[PDB]
Structure 1
Amino acid sequence: LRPIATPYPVKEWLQPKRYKAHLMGTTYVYDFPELFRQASSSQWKNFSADVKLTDDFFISNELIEDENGELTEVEREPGANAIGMVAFKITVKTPEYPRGRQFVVVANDITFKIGSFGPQEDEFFNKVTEYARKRGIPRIYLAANSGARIGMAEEIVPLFQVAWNDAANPDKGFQYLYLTSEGMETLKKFDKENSVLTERTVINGEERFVIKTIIGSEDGLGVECLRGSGLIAGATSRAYHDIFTITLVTCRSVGIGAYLVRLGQRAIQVEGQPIILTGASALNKVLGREVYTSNLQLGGTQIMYNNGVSHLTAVDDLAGVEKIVEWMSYVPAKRNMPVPILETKDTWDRPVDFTPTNDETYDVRWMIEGRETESGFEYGLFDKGSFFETLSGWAKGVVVGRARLGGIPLGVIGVETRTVENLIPADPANPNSAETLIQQAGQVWFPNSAFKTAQAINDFNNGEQLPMMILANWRGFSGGQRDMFNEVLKYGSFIVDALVDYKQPIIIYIPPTGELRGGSWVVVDPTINADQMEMYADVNARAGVLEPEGTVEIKFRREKLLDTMNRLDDHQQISKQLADRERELLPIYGQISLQFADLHDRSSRMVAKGVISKELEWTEARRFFFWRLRRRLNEEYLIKRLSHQASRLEKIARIRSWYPASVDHEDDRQVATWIEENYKTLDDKLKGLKLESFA
């Protein structure tokens, strides 16, 4: 016992495994429920400082398999785990769910065989994933592992013999490995006969049992671990389309561990904890040079956070757990439950303060969440303090995160207007490799930012089941050689596919000073998903096939400009006199044609042509969007009830035929108010529509 004379018992001595976990730079697996209790308690503190919490606000029950392999809740002492994978079912009262929300936490035990995945760990991880999927509840994975378990048949190590070419000179080589009748009997004695595949041979009267295959008696040596790895890789792929999945890399995450991080998609990496496939020393053996110094060069946050594998980084385990809890606050309690409303001090009924200017550089985050100025706080479109940015280390030209609009959670995509620089590190494996600095112009979709956009759309849709707003402000895709070679078309197409799959309301809004051109409009048009998408443009937004310079270059050429010079009152001395005035007003007539082109690019044309639902004023956008979204969520709820009993067009027309004659279908507030006052009446209607018998 070390140390002696502590006020309370030494937890690292009561359970030496806790001390082993700490030596390896991570939290002991049985101490993670306490971190979730601390993080959940903090959630309440930042929400309402005055609320009084008792320990019954948080329940954590360990999950273990019974005799029939069925998961059951247990209360036992830490360190009693017979396998290297542990799970907990957590029931927490949170600001969004004051009566309680549940989730499962699965975690490797880094103290159990270096957190390696053997067949029993794979089977348990899969059972826990299926448990969460069946219930529709989130699955949190805490990664601290060494990949698939490796081993040899240890019982064959002291028994095997080698059939030397020349018994006197071992350096001359050998023909095969074999067992004697003695070794074969040792195996028969311990019932390990099936540990080897032998072919009986007689050499100089002596009977040699040639080793054809080593199988081993212990399960968890090779390919059986690899099979279990594929099982959990497939299970995690499926879990991502079904429930909310998130991973915290709390110590190293190796091989299958690294794949699980990516397959669950949502990943928080603790600083200094690597996500790797093969370790640096093994890579050095294969390369035949000391190419890499550490595993952090291969899978540290400067790799994984910068390339988007890690959505966030955390300074320590508790910071990571806090980020999970915060991410979950935007997510429904379980699959197909409504998005969790959380009204705060910042109410819907207010104008939007921060306004972007054409002559001044702005951070898109100010438009989203507002900004602190010397004269006070300028409110953004969304609730003050509600913006939770993710994938912040990668493709910084697009800004993605979760926010709240009068308490309604949603995914947000914004465009960074400032030039973005990213540094490609020098490849240690190549001597002719130096670090590259890539500059990417603002408001242009590049391969990485097009990929980030599609990824964001998919992550809001799957598991999170959130509505979304895209503050659409792109000039187009980068059509240059390097970006075309780097497959910008592939990544741009992923955006389209992501939108086609979207199951919650989407609002596309070209903001003030914003633009949507040829290539960028295509990929975000509401006809891609008419059931879910709506487009709006600010009164101060622009949209056209080309920018005005482009339209002029193609459709307002020299001849047209010269015919227009016949607005200005003005053979050899005349030809030089015409060319004198023609060179004089060409700069101003260029501005005239540019302005003529720009007059087609307005929200009024967009309205007249029926390509946008409405033109809006930025200051009034929060009030407008709050009721449009609230009304859309209410109607979406009614369409789904109708479905559990026809095209969408027929469904919504039937629901709207139930609205009183006096209700204006175009008034969002009135429609939302009527539905919410009549949910139980509409239920009676839906239940009566059970006069359903159709062949």
Structure 2
Amino acid sequence: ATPYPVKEWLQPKRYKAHLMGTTYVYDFPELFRQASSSQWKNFSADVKLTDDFFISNELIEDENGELTEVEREPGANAIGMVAFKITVKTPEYPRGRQFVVVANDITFKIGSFGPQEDEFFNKVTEYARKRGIPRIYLAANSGARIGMAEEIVPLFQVAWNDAANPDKGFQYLYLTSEGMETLKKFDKENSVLTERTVINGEERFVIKTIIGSEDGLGVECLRGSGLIAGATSRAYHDIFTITLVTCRSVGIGAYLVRLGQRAIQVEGQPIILTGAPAINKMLGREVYTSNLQLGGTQIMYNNGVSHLTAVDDLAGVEKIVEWMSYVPAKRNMPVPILETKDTWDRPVDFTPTNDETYDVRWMIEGRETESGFEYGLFDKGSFFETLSGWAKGVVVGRARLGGIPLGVIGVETRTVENLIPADPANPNSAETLIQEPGQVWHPNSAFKTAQAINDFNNGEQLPMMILANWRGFSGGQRDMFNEVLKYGSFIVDALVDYKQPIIIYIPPTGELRGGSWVVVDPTINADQMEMYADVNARAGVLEPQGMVGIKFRREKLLDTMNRLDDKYRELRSQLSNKSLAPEVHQQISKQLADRERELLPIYGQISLQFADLHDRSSRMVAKGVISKELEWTEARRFFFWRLRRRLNEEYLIKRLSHQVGEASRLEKIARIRSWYPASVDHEDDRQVATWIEENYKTLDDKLKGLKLESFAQDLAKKI
């Protein structure tokens, strides 16, 4: 009979949790242990983990409401919101990093949000924020806590219109002196707001407002939803936030998942507002058959609300751990550099061809060809895609470049068949398929791009590379009506807001035209952006077919003919050098038309090539619009050292902006680069980075001392 203690017996709560299809909240810490363990297996199997590599500390409020640490038997939570402070030693943080886990106890009042759960959830968020560590939220709730005064139930009355016929209706509810007394025989007068009265022989205290002695019935909870809605809203711009939906999320539940932005949905676990049964009655019909139709994975994932989906709670936890490996340990710390086995010093194997279609992910991480492995731009097996089920025109995810973490955005060259499911509420609604052309921003892909730039920026504080390859925005009616202009603008706002280095880069077979260029041009945020174009990329306000349709028309094509074709030329002269007889002019005009009707194609071809010669990177360098043109196969090596140099100098600027007399970026960049010895030329990225890194110790000193002179000069002289 079970060789070991049945845990669902020792703690029935655990069984209720399992009965509702989710993990028992006090069992989630172990799930994070298991995932952190795998993190190491997948990175270095010969590593031997002790037991102190993972530490989970439960946090509960003390008397002054200050969260402290407590070790105690699970199932002892007085409120339905629990929290843990994890501090685990991971590959990118051998000495360990820390984060907090906030979770609804789904067994406690079905995970409902009451004033206490709310204030606790808020108290925890500020705990993380003040420390700068990530805030993980496991959501499994039933929303705001509802209720009625159960004390007024057993004793209210009905001022009927006609006592002997209740059907005729009533006029008001009230309590008898008896009831009015029954309340104090327990001290619950506040439970109601009455108004004295007498009648055909009796007392009548009409109820004007039922309030209830119990806390957590209505608006006070609503008040608490808002405290935490704005708290998360704020946290997202301050620390790495992320929510995992483990059973379901309703009301502020569905709003907290979104406000935290990054969200992982376990399949079968709905994210909803008002439930299907409620909607059905509302609509007076049996329209929906399951909450999944409202907030299931085919909605929230295809929608973009859920950045990822997981088959079960453990899978979802492993995805949170994986996501964190890219983020800094705490706010304002250098990005977690984890050198893999895929050295930076190598060529880039897979290369596109302006013919055969390709998956942009190949360029990103590589291809597993039937004859070996073609390495991509980034570290082998490092790409961690996100928002994969929404706006597939774009490809966003995290990655590592020579061990350096960064956000990556690519363009999907293949046409996406976005299939929209019919609306059950509309008897004559039809499943419909939208075809989204590759290399073109649509309302959804623009918004997605914006979302990604913002998520790399706010909590992750990451560098980012955009393999820009857009022919523009869709300008057709439908997409203009769907406000592609608004989502397109969001892109600019996101880049202006970005605080880490940005690399824009038109890849090989790529191009970046009119509308698309304006939203990614370095000038938008000169401080962090830089653009590069592959020697084999293209760029211009219009495409040749377009550029020609306006500045290389027929007449012009013909002028080129008369100048470059002997037959057409000599023919032109005969029609304009001598007065010919009608019969002869006709005879020759025909020979003209037929010649035009034979060279025209080739010549039209010639004009395109003329146009395409301006759309070259060489011109980009010439006009000073990019920083450099590059050799694709050499990109990895090049960017590896450009990012590392950029990052290294940025870290120095930030320090040189923590003291007193704030100076312009320029000056800080001056002061810094004068620290370099003649033996290292500024223009050399690998020369600078290596330098800064080899002297961090020394540098650290120079900066600290720089502050001392300040915080002691303004004082020494403050006479």
Same fold (TM over 0.5): yes
Distance 1:569 1:79, change over 3 A: closer
- After TM superposition, give the deviation of residue 693 of structure 1 in Å: 5.9
- How many percent of aligned residue pairs carry the same amino acid? 99
Q: Secondary structure at the match of 1:123?
A: helix
Higher alpha-carbon deviation: 640-649 or 167-176: 640-649
User: Structure 1, residues 484-530: CA drift from partner, whole Å, max 9, x if none?
Assistant: 00000000000000000000000001000000000011000000010
What displacement does 1:373 show? 0.9
Residue 692 (structure 1) shift: 6.0
- How far, CA to CA, are the matches of 1:619 and 1:221 in structure 2? 64
Q: Who is 1:495 aligned against?
A: 491
SS at structure 1 position matched to 2:46: coil
Using the TM superposition, give the Cα deviation of residue 691 of structure 1 relative to its aligned residue in structure 2, in angstroms. Answer: 6.9
Deviations 1:35-65 (A, max 9, x none): 0000000000000000001111000011000
Distance 1:691 1:13, change over 3 A: closer
What residue in structure 1 maps to residue 201 of structure 2? 205
Write the deviation string for residues 372-428 of structure 1: whole angstroms up to 9, x where unpaired.
112111000000010100000001110000000000000000000000011111110
Q: Distance in 1 between matches of 2:203 and 2:259?
A: 53
- Partner-residue secondary structure (3-state), 1:242: coil
Distance 1:129 1:330 in 2: 21
| Structure 1 residue 572, shift from structure 2 partner | 2.5
Counterparts of 1:467 and 1:447, CA distance in 2:
25
SS at match of 1:203: coil
Residue 101 (1) aligns with residue 118 (2): no
1:74-93 matched pairs, under 5 angstroms: 74-93=70-89
Q: State which drifts further: 233-242 or 203-212.
A: 203-212
Q: Distance in 2 between matches of 1:684 and 1:139?
A: 33
Counterpart-to-counterpart distance in 2, 1:219 and 1:139: 28
Structure 2 residue aligned with 1:592 = 606
TM-score, structure 2 length as denominator? Answer: 0.95
Q: Which moved more, 1:433-442 or 1:574-583?
A: 574-583
Q: How many pairs does the alignment contain?
A: 690
How far, CA to CA, are the matches of 2:205 and 2:136 in structure 1? 51
C-alpha distance in structure 2 between counterparts of 1:250 and 1:532, whole Å = 38
Distance 2:609 2:621 in 1: 20
Separation in 2, partners of 1:567, 1:590? 15
Pairwise CA distance, 1:644: 1.1
Displacement after TM superposition at 1:8 (Å): 0.2
Cα distance in 2 between the residues matched to 1:683 and 1:620? 33
Q: Secondary structure at the match of 1:250?
A: strand
Deviations 1:627-657 (A, max 9, x none): 1000001100111111112111221122112
Q: Which residue of 2 aligns with 1:609?
A: 623
- Give the alignment partner of residue 622 of structure 1, picking from 636, 659, 665: 636
Q: Could you tell me how far apart the structure 2 residues matched to 1:212 and 1:179 are?
A: 11
Say which SS state the counterpart of residue 162 (structure 1) adopts: strand
Distance of 1:237 and 1:98 partners within structure 2: 31
SS at match of 2:377: coil
1:559-609 CA distance string (max 9 Å, x none):
211110123444332222222211211101100000000000011000011
| Secondary structure of the corresponding residue to residue 255 of structure 2 | helix
What is the CA deviation profile of residues 414-444 of structure 1, one whole-angstrom value per residue up to 9, with x for unaligned ones? 0000000111111101112111100010000
Q: Please state how far the C-alpha of 1:557 moved relative to its aligned partner.
A: 1.2
Partner-residue secondary structure (3-state), 1:566: helix
- Give secondary structure in 2 for the equivalent of 1:167: coil
Aligned partners of 1:520 and 1:208: how far apart in 2?
A: 74
Distance 1:507 1:650 in 2: 23
Per-residue CA distance 1:652-676 (angstroms, 9 max, x = gap)? 1221122112321110000001111
**1:449, CA displacement in angstroms?**
0.4
Assess, with a 3 A threshold, how the Cα gap between structure 1 residues 690 and 23 changes in structure 2: closer, same or farther.
Answer: closer
Q: Whole-Å Cα distance in 2 between the matches of residues 620 and 336 of structure 1?
A: 31
CA–CA separation in structure 2 for the residues paired with 1:568 and 1:443: 37
Post-superposition offset of 1:340: 0.2
Following the alignment from structure 1 to structure 2, what is the Cα–Cα distance between the partners of residues 295 and 659? 63
Residue among 634, 641, 659 paired with 2:676 = 659
Secondary structure in 1 matching 2:221: helix
| Aligned-partner SS, 1:200 | coil
CA RMSD, Structure 1 to Structure 2 (Å): 1.0
Separation (CA, whole Å) in 2 of partners of 1:53 and 1:683? 33
Kindly indicate whether residue 685 of structure 2 is the aligned counterpart of residue 668 of structure 1.
yes
Separation of aligned partners in 2, 1:374 and 1:500: 44
Q: 1:215-252: per-residue Cα shift (whole Å, max 9, x none)?
A: 00000000000000000000000010000001110001
Match of 2:648 among 630, 634, 655: 634
TM-score (norm 1): 0.98
Larger C-alpha radius of gyration, 1 or 2? 2
Deviation at 1:259, TM superposition (A): 0.2
Shift of 1:685: 2.5
CA drift at 1:203: 1.2
Structure 1 residues 115-170: Cα deviation after superposition (integer angstroms, max 9, x where no partner): 00000000000000000000000000000000000000000001111100011110
**Residues 335-388 of structure 1: CA distance to partner in whole angstroms, max 9, x if unpaired?**
001100000110101100000111111000000000111211100000001010
Does 2:118 correspond to 1:110?
Answer: no
Residue 680 of structure 1 aligns to a residue whose secondary structure is helix
Per the alignment, in what secondary structure is the counterpart of residue 398 of structure 2? strand
Q: Return closer, same or farther for 1:569/1:327 CA change in 2, 3 Å cut-off.
A: closer
Structure 1 residue 611, shift from structure 2 partner:
0.5
SS at match of 1:546: coil
* CA deviation vs aligned residue, 1:54-110 (integer Å, no higher than 9, x gap): 111000011000011100010000100010000000010000001010000000011
Name the SS of the counterpart of 1:89 in structure 2: strand
In 2, distance between residues paired with 1:685 and 1:75?
A: 44
Q: Which residue of 1 aligns with 2:422?
A: 426
Paired with 1:125 and 1:203, the residues of 2 have a C-alpha distance of 51
In structure 2, the residue corresponding to 1:137 is in which secondary structure? coil
Shift of 1:177: 0.3
The CA distance in 2 between the partners of 1:687 and 1:94, in whole Å, is 30
